[PDB]
Design a protein around this ligand. Structure first.
Ligand SMILES: N[C@@H](CCC(=O)N[C@@H](CS)C(=O)NCC(=O)O)C(=O)O
Ligand SMILES: N[C@@H](CCC(=O)N[C@@H](CS)C(=O)NCC(=O)O)C(=O)O
Lengths: 209, 209
């Protein structure tokens, strides 16, 4: 640290890393980028891949949400207990990322027309995570191992936003359902999820969810 | 080890991890999955996210190409010299992944119609990596630090396939151009890139490139 999150006034790709920081008792600064500032071009041009989030950790400047998650993950000890667990954490996170990309595609590309189809395919997309849970202490702890990892936060956010998109989409998945309520119940996390900082921010930037 | 790569008879998302194995002097088994075997459904159903590559490392079974790259990366010591370098390696790899996704989209979704546009935007997509290089020992070594990492292999493959898509797309990028020739010149890598094992495999599965 100190940590600084440079992003638009949305939860989006910063929601999970924010939950991580909050739950780990970390302090950070939120640098909010309005549309006007982005449309002007200066900031965008300075970003490596021309996109936000931009993360500051002392003298270290990072880009890419998953790079930030892995950074906070290895640095804060939320990346598995060993190399094998670390690989499992990656496999989970990679899966979460694939579905997030499909979700964002729906939201920004063809929400109205493609929504029903997306919802039909959803259970097949959630299945893998339910399976992962059933293989780890009967799904009573975390997604990988007995300790929480950055993949847990990313998975939790994914499940939360999909529940807003299709309420009750977790009803057919017992372990996933229980996993969300359990994680969401974590003191520092519960406090964050209920805060104006989280609640008063739209999930996405186009008003859809 | 032992390592086993279960994949279709294409370079695709296994090309980079194969270059890594080869260049590091590693031995592995190639389990080739024909269309008939995949269309039958048994293997697909057993895959976590229903897709290949599937990787075997002794008793460890992994899925997701980047999970395999990171696995081989941390296990073989190709993941930066410290935590900061490791995060930079992720940032590079995340960027390579974003562009690979755009490329695959072109190849399978609308190659014919969207090709020219993709090629127009290409330099803006390659720029970040040229910049990364200019900031690391003047681009004379690797993408991050003085040692090679899994991100190097993934970046090299990306550059190779784009050069096949748009020959000379690296002509405006001196460091990227030099970086490819240098890496491609590496003994074990050069030997692999020239082999029937690599050469006689199509870049993609739809005959396009
Ligand atoms: N792969 C990147 C995606 C970043 C991204 O898509 N950023 C968007 C907002 S969520 C952005 O900055 N859009 C502005 C633009 O591209 O003009 C990540 O993982 O962070
Ligand atoms: N995100 C995955 C992508 C895997 C993937 O797209 N696999 C394709 C081949 S490149 C596949 O198995 N397609 C068969 C299917 O989905 O039916 C990774 O990084 O490996």
């Amino acid at each position: 640290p100190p940590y600084t999150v440079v992003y638009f006034p949305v939860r989006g790709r910063c929601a999970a890393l924010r939950m991580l920081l909050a739950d780990q008792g970390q302090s950070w600064k939120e640098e909010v980028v309005t549309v006007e500032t982005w449309q002007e071009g200066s900031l965008k041009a300075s970003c490596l891949y021309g996109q936000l989030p931009k993360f500051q950790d002392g003298d270290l400047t990072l880009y890419q949400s998953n790079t930030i998650l892995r950074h906070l993950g290895r640095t804060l000890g939320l990346y598995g207990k060993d190399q094998q667990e670390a690989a499992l954490v990656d496999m989970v996170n990679d899966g979460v990322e694939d579905l997030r990309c499909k979700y964002i595609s729906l939201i920004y590309t063809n929400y109205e027309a493609g929504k029903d189809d997306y919802v039909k395919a959803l259970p097949g997309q959630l299945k893998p995570f339910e399976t992962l849970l059933s293989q780890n202490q009967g799904g009573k702890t975390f997604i990988v191992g007995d300790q929480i990892s950055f993949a847990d936060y990313n998975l939790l956010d994914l499940l939360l936003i999909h529940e807003v998109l299709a309420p009750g989409c977790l009803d057919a998945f017992p372990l996933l359902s229980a996993y969300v309520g359990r994680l969401s119940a974590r003191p520092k996390l519960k406090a964050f999820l209920a805060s104006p900082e989280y609640v008063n921010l739209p999930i996405n930037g186009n008003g859809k969810q």
